[PDB]
Amino acid sequence: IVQQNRRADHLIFPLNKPTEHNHASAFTRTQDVPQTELQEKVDQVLQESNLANPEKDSKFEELPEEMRKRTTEMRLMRELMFREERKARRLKKIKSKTYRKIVAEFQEEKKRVIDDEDDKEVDTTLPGWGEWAGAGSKPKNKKRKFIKKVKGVVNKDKRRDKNKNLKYQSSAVPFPFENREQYERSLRMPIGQEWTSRASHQELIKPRIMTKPGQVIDPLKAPFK
Amino acid sequence: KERENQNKFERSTYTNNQTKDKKLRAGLKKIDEQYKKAVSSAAATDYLLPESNGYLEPENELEKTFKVQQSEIKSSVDVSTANKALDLSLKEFGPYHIKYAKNGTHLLITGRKGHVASMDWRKGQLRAELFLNETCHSATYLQNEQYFAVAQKKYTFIYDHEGTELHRLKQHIEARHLDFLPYHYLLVTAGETGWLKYHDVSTGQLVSELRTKAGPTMAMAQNPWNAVMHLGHSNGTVSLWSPSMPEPLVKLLSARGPVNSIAIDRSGYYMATTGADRSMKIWDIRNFKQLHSVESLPTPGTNVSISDTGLLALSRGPHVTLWKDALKLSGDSKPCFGSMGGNPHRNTPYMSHLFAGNKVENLGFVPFEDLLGVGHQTGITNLIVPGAGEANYDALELNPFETKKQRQEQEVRTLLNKLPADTITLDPNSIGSVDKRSSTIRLNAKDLDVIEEALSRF
Amino acid sequence: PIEYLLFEEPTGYAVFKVKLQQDDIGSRLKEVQEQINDFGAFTKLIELVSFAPFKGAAEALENANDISEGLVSESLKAILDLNLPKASSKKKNITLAISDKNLGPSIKEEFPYVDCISNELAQDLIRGVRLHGEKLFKGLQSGDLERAQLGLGHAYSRAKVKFSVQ
Amino acid sequence: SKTRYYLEQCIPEMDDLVEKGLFTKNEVSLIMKKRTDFEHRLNSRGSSINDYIKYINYESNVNKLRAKRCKRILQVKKTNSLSDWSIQQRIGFIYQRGTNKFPQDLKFWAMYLNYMKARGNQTSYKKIHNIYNQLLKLHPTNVDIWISCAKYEYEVHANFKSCRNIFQNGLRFNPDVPKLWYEYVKFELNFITKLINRRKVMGLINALRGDIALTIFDVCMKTLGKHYINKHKGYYAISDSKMNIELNKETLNYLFSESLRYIKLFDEFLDLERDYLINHVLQFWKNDMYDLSLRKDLPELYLKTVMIDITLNIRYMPVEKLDIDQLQLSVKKYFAYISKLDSASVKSLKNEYRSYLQDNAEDDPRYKILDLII
Amino acid sequence: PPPDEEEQLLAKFVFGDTTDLQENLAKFNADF
RNA sequence: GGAAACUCAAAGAGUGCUAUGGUAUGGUGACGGAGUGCGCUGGUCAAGAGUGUAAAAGCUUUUUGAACAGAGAGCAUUUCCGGCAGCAGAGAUUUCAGCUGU
Report the alpha-carbon distance of residue D242 to residue D230 in Å, rounded.
Answer: 17
Helix and strand numbers, DSSP H then E, in chain B? 5, 28
CB contact at 8 A, B258 and B276: yes
- The radius of gyration of chain D's CA atoms, rounded to the nearest angstrom, is 31
Backbone angles phi, psi at B250, to 5 degrees: -140, 150
Report the alpha-carbon distance of residue B95 to residue B359 in Å, rounded.
Answer: 8
Determine whether the interchain pair D69/E7 forms a contact, defined as Cβ–Cβ distance below 8 Å: yes
Q: Which of B148, B230, B160 is nearest to B187 (CA)?
A: B148
Determine whether the interchain pair B14/A180 forms a contact, defined as Cβ–Cβ distance below 8 Å: yes
How far CA B232 is from CA of B271, B290, B322, D208, in Å, comes to 12, 16, 22, 105
Report the alpha-carbon distance of residue D131 to residue A125 in Å, rounded.
Answer: 93
Determine whether the distance from the CB of D96 to the nearest atom of strand F is below 7 Å. yes
Strand partners, D255: none
Closest residue of chain D to B49, computed from CA coordinates:
D29
How far CA B378 is from CA of A92, B91, B111, in Å, comes to 94, 5, 9
B155-182 core/surface letters (b: 16 or more CB in 10 A; e: else)? bbbbbeeebeeebebeebebbbbbbbbb
Report the alpha-carbon distance of residue C101 to residue C70 in Å, rounded.
Answer: 9
Q: Which of D277, D267, D272 is nearest to D195 (CA)?
A: D272
Breaks in chain D follow which residues, C to N over 2.5 Å? 206, 360
Contacts of A10 by beta carbon, 8 Å cutoff, 6+ apart: A206, A207, A208, A210
DSSP, collapsed to helix, strand or coil, labels residue A61 as: coil
Work out the angle at residue C87's Cα, subtended by the Cα atoms of residues C82 and C89, and round it to the nearest 5 degrees: 120
List of long-range contacts for D49-58, beta carbons under 8 Å, 24+ apart: D49/D98, D49/D102, D49/D105, D49/D108, D52/D94, D52/D95, D52/D97, D52/D98, D52/D101, D52/D102, D52/D108, D53/D108, D53/D111, D55/D94, D56/D91, D56/D94, D56/D95, D56/D111, D56/D115, D58/D34, D58/E14
Report the alpha-carbon distance of residue B372 to residue B312 in Å, rounded.
Answer: 11
Determine whether the distance from the CB of D157 to the nearest atom of strand F is below 7 Å. no
> Which experimental technique did the depositors report for determining this structure?
cryo-EM
DSSP codes, D296-355: SS-HHHHHHHHHHHHHTS----S--HHHHHHHHHHHHHHHHHHTT-SSHHHHHHHHHHHH
Report the alpha-carbon distance of residue B22 to residue B289 in Å, rounded.
Answer: 44
Question: Which segments of D206-240 does DSSP mark as H helices, in order?
Answer: 211-231
DSSP state for residue B338 in the 8-state scheme = S
Residue nearest to nucleotide F69 (CA to C1'): A32
Determine whether the interchain pair D8/A198 forms a contact, defined as Cβ–Cβ distance below 8 Å: yes
Report the alpha-carbon distance of residue A36 to residue A20 in Å, rounded.
Answer: 27
Suggest the residue from E7, E10, E14, E18 to mutate for an interface test with chain D (most D CBs closer than 10 A): E14
Q: Which nucleotides of F are covered by protein (CB under 7 A)?
A: 8-12, 16-29, 31-36, 40-43, 61-62, 68-73, 79-84, 87-89, 95-102
DSSP, collapsed to helix, strand or coil, labels residue B17 as: coil
Give the 3-state secondary structure percentages of chain B, helix then strand then coil, rounded to 5: 15, 30, 55
Helix axes of D178-205 and A73-80: crossing angle, nearest 10 degrees: 140
Chain E neighbors of D27, CB-CB under 8 A: 15
Alpha carbons within 13 angstroms on the beta-carbon side of residue B39 total 20
DSSP codes, chain C: ---EEEEEETTEEEEEEE-SPPPSTTTTSHHHHHTTT-HHHHTTTEEEEEEEE-SSHHHHHHHHHHHHTT---HHHHHHHHHHS-B--SSSS-EEEE-S-TTTHHHHHHH-TTEEEE-SHHHHHHHHHHHHHGGGTTTT--SS-HHHHHHHHHHHHHHHHHT----
Question: Which segments of B351-456 does DSSP mark as H helices, in order?
Answer: 404-416, 452-455
Chain D neighbors of E15, CB-CB under 8 A: 27, 30-31
Contacts of D151 by beta carbon, 8 Å cutoff, 6+ apart: none
Distance in angstroms: CA B425, C1' F19? 43
Burial class (CB in 10 A: 0-12, 13-18, 19+), B100: buried
CB contact at 8 A, B272 and B327: yes
CB contact at 8 A, D214 and D280: yes
Other chains touching C, judged by 3 or more CB pairs under 8 Å: A, D
CB contact B249 to A (< 8 Å): no
Strand partners, B186: B181, B200
DSSP state for residue B67 in the 8-state scheme = T
Chain A neighbors of C86, CB-CB under 8 A: 21-22, 24, 30-31
CB contact at 8 A, D72 and E2: yes
CB contact at 8 A, D95 and D115: yes
What is the number of other CB atoms lying within 10 angstroms of the CB of residue A127? 8
Burial class (CB in 10 A: 0-12, 13-18, 19+), D356: buried
Report the alpha-carbon distance of residue B424 to residue D111 in Å, rounded.
Answer: 59
Q: At what resolution in Å was this solved?
A: 12.3
Backbone angles phi, psi at B76, to 5 degrees: -80, -20
Strand F-contacting residues in A 113-152, CB cut-off 7 angstroms: none
Contacts of B158 by beta carbon, 8 Å cutoff, 6+ apart: B142, B147, B148, B149, B150, B165, B166, B167, B168, B169, B201
D103-120 core/surface letters (b: 16 or more CB in 10 A; e: else)? bbbeebbebbbebbeebe
A134 φ/ψ sector (left φ>0, alpha ψ -120 to 50, else beta): left
How far CA A36 is from CA of D165, D175, D185, D347, in Å, comes to 12, 11, 17, 43
DSSP state for residue B159 in the 8-state scheme = E
DSSP, collapsed to helix, strand or coil, labels residue B228 as: coil
Report the alpha-carbon distance of residue B305 to residue B262 in Å, rounded.
Answer: 8
Q: Which of B381, B335, B336, B373 is nearest to B355 (CA)?
A: B381
For residue D271, which amino acid is it?
D
Contacts of C107 by beta carbon, 8 Å cutoff, 6+ apart: C72, C80, C96, C98, C114, C116
Strand partners, B239: B231, B251
Q: Could you tell me the sign of the dihedral formed by the alpha carbons of D346, D351, D356, D358, in that order? A: positive
Suggest the residue from C17, C138, C158, C164 to mutate for an interface test with chain D (most D CBs closer than 10 A): C138
Contacts of D200 by beta carbon, 8 Å cutoff, 6+ apart: none
DSSP, collapsed to helix, strand or coil, labels residue B275 as: strand
What is the number of other CB atoms lying within 10 angstroms of the CB of residue D140? 27
Backbone angles phi, psi at D68, to 5 degrees: -65, -45
